[PDB]
């Protein structure tokens, strides 16, 4: 009955734990320049 309600709180915790793990591992793509016109910057 009310067993379920507080267990519905440990949801959004893990939602955010999904979310930060989802996000910043993408953003890792420190030199990316291989030519003269590349290495201008």
């Amino acid at each position: 009955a009310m067993r379920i309600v507080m267990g519905s709180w440990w949801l959004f915790t893990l939602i955010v734990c999904s979310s930060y793990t989802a996000n910043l591992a993408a953003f890792l793509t420190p030199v990316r320049t291989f030519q003269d016109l590349s290495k201008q910057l």
Binding site: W9, T13, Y20
Partner: peptide
């Protein structure tokens, strides 16, 4: 970003307060 943990935790303890306030009052009932 990283201190949302306790922002969920203390609200969960707030959810832990109401059913205890009704349970020990039912023991008083």
């Amino acid at each position: 970003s990283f201190a949302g943990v306790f922002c969920i935790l203390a609200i969960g303890l707030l959810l832990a307060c109401l059913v205890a306030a009704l349970e020990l009052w039912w023991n008083s009932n």
